Amino acid sequence: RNVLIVAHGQPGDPAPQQRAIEALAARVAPLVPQACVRGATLAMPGALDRADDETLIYPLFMATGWFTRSELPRRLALAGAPKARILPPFGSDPGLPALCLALIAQAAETQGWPLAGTRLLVAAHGSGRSRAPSEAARRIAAGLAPYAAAATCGFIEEAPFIADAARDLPERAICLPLFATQAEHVTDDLPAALSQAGFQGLVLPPVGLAPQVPAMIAESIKAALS
Ligand code: NA
């Protein structure tokens, strides 16, 4: 019944970060009538004190790791919710590869470019402490590649660096930022990295802002309820 959609915090004022996650949880809410859905950012002190032992946590994270396995359970157990169930993260959501494909196909159609003749670039944060985020982004690119000319990845934290990965690509290219929130996306400053690369293609909004994301999260919540 109780569901909390949790975002990683980012530097700056936590109030607009909290409002963004509340706005997302409000779009999820009418799609899961059997549950009480609310949003929280870990940048806000007391983010998790509304959670209890019967609350489900939908983490807006790109992969599983030390945070999902040890940190988030510690930050919940202290808050009074040790038995709170953590669902698979946004990055491992079964609907994410189809969502990326629909956004890229829609984008190619607006440009008047055939998808088979378009080069794809999946831009993601990656990680310096785990191999899980880059393996997940490569799985996305490898799933998109059969529908396009080619698909590769570029990262902020690890090689291949986005400034290198976006270099020497054609004009008919689309970059999809594989980010769950606008706050995490803006921090990485993809426009500066793509400018250094001389990227000439189309740069889409981050995947976490797509219109189908609330329905995707709702289906993952519904599947975890009994
Ligand atoms: Na299509």
Residue numbers in the entry: 3 to 228
From the paper:
The final step involves the insertion of iron into sirohydrochlorin and is catalysed by a sirohydrochlorin ferrochelatases. However, our in vivo functional data has demonstrated that Pp-CbiX acts as a ferrochelatase, by acting to insert iron into the tetrapyrrole substrate in preference to cobalt ion.
In addition, with this purified sample, crystals were grown and the crystal structure of Pp-CbiX was determined to a resolution of 1.9 Å. The overall structure of Pp-CbiX is characteristic of the type II class of metal chelatase enzymes. A search of the PBD using PDBeFold (EMBL-EBI) showed that the full length Pp-CbiX protein is most similar to CbiK from Salmonella enterica, a cobaltochelatase (Se-CbiK). The structural overlay shows the metallated tetrapyrrole fits into the central cavity in Pp-CbiX and indicates that the active site residues in Pp-CbiX are located in the CT half of the protein, similar to Se-CbiK but unlike CbiXL and SirB that have active site residues in their NT. The overlay highlights the conserved position in the active site of the (His127) residue of Pp-CbiX with the equivalent His residue in Se-CbiK (His145), shown to be involved in metal binding in the bound tetrapyrrole. The functional importance of (His127) from Pp-CbiX was demonstrated by mutating this residue to alanine, which resulted in the loss of in vivo ferrochelatase activity of Pp-CbiXH127A. Mutagenesis of (His187) in our protein demonstrated that this residue was indeed essential for the ferrochelatase activity of Pp-CbiX. Interestingly, in the structure of Pp-CbiX, the functionally essential (His187) points away from the active site of the enzyme. So it is feasible that (His187) of Pp-CbiX is also at a very flexible region of the structure, and this crystal form has captured the (His187) residue in an inactive conformation in which it is moved out of the way of the active site.
